[PDB]
Design a protein around this ligand. Structure first.
Ligand SMILES: [Mn+2]
Ligand SMILES: [Mn+2]
Ligand SMILES: [Mn+2]
Ligand SMILES: [Mn+2]
Ligand SMILES: [Mn+2]
Ligand SMILES: [Mn+2]
Lengths: 310, 310, 310
């Protein structure tokens, strides 16, 4: 039980500052203690200085390629995460990455899949995060990771992303909690036949059935490793207020953690990303605690925490 | 895909002013744009001036027949809605009526059923709205539409309602979300064997099963048209605060819209009423937005909006 | 249909004052009227003066035996409740006990089981309340009733509890809503094979299935009497704010009452405790009303109240 808590305080995939504080806030609530307490030999892995990056990000408005914003900064930072997550996995340790916005998944998914080539990816998010370079309206890269990972709109992806390995295939991605998918993304999921479970399926079949369906979808031989990239805005704003792109009608606090228990129960989780926690996006310091604690709760539940004896 | 958005700014079936602002508020949030955006050729249908009606209503306290309040005003306005909804349906257009309190269902149901005689009616409400003239304690007519439509307590229904066609039979009504039914109404539903699904059934079988049961109940040949009269107070006050008769323990925001998706999916929806939105019954202008947006959301989901590709 | 509303204004099993006001507050909201209105011939049973007890409790800090706090006061008061609940049951009347903290279950369970020896016990709580004398860290007895009732850690239970009859066996206890069980309690439930249904099971199977499983677990011949000890903190703080030990991720208001309806439906409920309502633990006098009304709602639903005709 070896684990490497990968700290990825990045905010370049979006406009709001504060999300890069997630790592720090999570570790403050005792993330590592919880993990050690769960029997994991933990080690912190800092990939870069969040303060420096915020500095170079804030200033440089010239970092753009048409609609896409900060492709240079994003490509540079996510490549460091890739190298760190790749290394962590090669050493045989479990990489738990704390963001930071979802653009970091470029490095996490790339890193994990380049080591566990047949690993399935369960993307827990209210959004599809699959906007192509030409398609993205806002130009925020935290909503484009999967397009770049799947190598979509090839011709328009900046060369500064030439380092991204083409290891993710559409039949190895499964979404859970979708409810804010735009027209371009709807067509993509449909044309690529990507297993996507919206809030409609949750409401229709219940979270237990949805998780089972999601794990099956990316697990042919039913024995492949599984990775989860958890965007906290999948959970209803009621419980997860401090976040950049909230969307009403999400998972209840209970469903958010039950999902984790089912994956833990699975026994094949090989990696986990917990992203989009922006403490600076809350009114009361209570919203901040509700949010960050939910993060630590996801980590604990994913890594073994059960309500009863085990 | 022809639609007529019937504007019914009426508040005579109850005591609180503000509910007649629903139409205006809904159209402000872009109700018609959403509908056109969903592929419907829309047309607004104003049946009467909400300002004038509020004026004649406010003043005239003499409009009463024992317990029943404003039977003259209510009978006159609902007859105009009947004629408008009847006309809209005859032209082969889909009538989407925005209230206004639920007393307007006297005209909507009468209008739709006089054109589609075998149309089933799914009444989404926390209340049964079936108090008889002699039975109604409060005398508010927004809680009596179904008694008059079913022709109950015949002998005591004012003659100013003589225009109401006897087109609704008890085996063509199905309730969803019931939780505030009074003793008289409990006996009625039971003696008339009306298919009623309370929050108990939702909690017991889940919203998916309940909707299926409701659609079946009013669809013998399983091919009859279906009409939905949606009272927003069916949804828990948590999400729908600005409303005249709130009742704790309602449908979650998710269930409120999933229900709509299932009906849309059905393919036989022939009419829809969205009622009881009172913007003037909110503390923060946030309660107002939560409420009105939920209204537009019901319309979009009922009329075709899906979370994924379709 | 004879009932005895047992008033147990006790707070000695915990540190916060205010919980002893539950009885008074409940009766204020009309608890007895509701019961009579439900067809029960009610009678109030005061076992002791809540004001006097609070007085002797507040002062006496010397009432302790190591970690355990107020074992003398608790043992004395719970013995009075035992005698009262035992008497009420012998007279063939239904004992509805209103607390007061959960330490009162020492007398209720003992009283009911000494009359209905084969009665099952359904403990609705977020906590296991089974800490042993040596195990309890906080020393608060409202978290130790079941250990004493099951006669655990015998050797360390003060002799002032020598009156407690050994009538409860582990195969006659079933938990519902568990989510804050400590390590000692986890081991105990596991070693004793006690039927426990955590929020995990509720999220996984739904409340309907869980209740059925719980009733089955303590009902071998499927015809045994059933008793329910209802701790209100089983319900999510969102709905039940004013309480001593809140825990996030609980039963929704709907599940809290549906559970009651299923037990009522069962037809074998022989006793009910409603505990942990502390009015003095609320910010707005709204939290207080939300909480206390939920209490009366549990009593009504348990005792027969249905949403539709019956
Ligand atoms: Mn995301
Ligand atoms: Mn997202
Ligand atoms: Mn209504
Ligand atoms: Mn209603
Ligand atoms: Mn308890
Ligand atoms: Mn408890």
């Amino acid at each position: 039980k070896k684990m490497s808590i990968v700290l990825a305080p990045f905010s370049g995939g979006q406009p709001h500052s504060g999300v890069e504080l997630g790592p720090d806030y999570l570790l403050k609530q005792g993330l590592q203690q919880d993990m050690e307490k769960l029997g994991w030999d933990t080690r912190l892995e800092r990939v870069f200085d969040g303060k420096v990056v915020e500095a170079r990000k804030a200033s440089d408005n010239g970092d753009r390629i048409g609609r896409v914003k900060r492709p240079r900064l994003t490509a540079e930072c996510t490549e460091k995460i890739y190298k760190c997550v790749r290394r962590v996995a090669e050493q045989g340790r479990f990489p738990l990455t704390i963001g930071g916005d979802h653009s970091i998944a470029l490095g996490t998914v790339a890193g994990v899949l380049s080591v566990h080539p047949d690993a399935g990816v369960i993307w827990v998010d209210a959004h599809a995060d699959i906007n192509t370079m030409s398609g993205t309206v806002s130009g925020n890269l935290h909503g484009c990771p999967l397009s770049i990972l799947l190598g979509l709109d090839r011709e328009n992806i900046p060369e500064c992303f030439s380092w991204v390995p083409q290891v993710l295939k559409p039949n190895k991605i499964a979404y859970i909690g979708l409810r804010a998918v735009d027209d371009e993304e709807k067509k993509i999921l449909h044309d690529l036949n990507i297993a996507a479970f919206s809030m409609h399926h949750v409401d229709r079949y219940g979270i237990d059935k949805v998780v089972s369906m999601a794990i099956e979808a990316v697990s042919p031989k039913g024995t492949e490793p599984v990775m989860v990239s958890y965007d906290v805005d999948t959970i209803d704003p009621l419980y997860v207020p401090a976040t950049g792109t909230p969307v009403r009608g999400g998972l209840s606090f209970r469903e958010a953690l039950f999902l984790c228990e089912r994956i833990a129960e699975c026994g094949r989780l090989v990696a986990l990303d917990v992203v989009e926690c922006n403490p600076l996006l809350a009114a009361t310091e209570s919203h901040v605690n509700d949010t960050i604690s939910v993060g630590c709760a996801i980590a604990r539940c994913m890594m073994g925490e059960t309500l009863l004896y085990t």
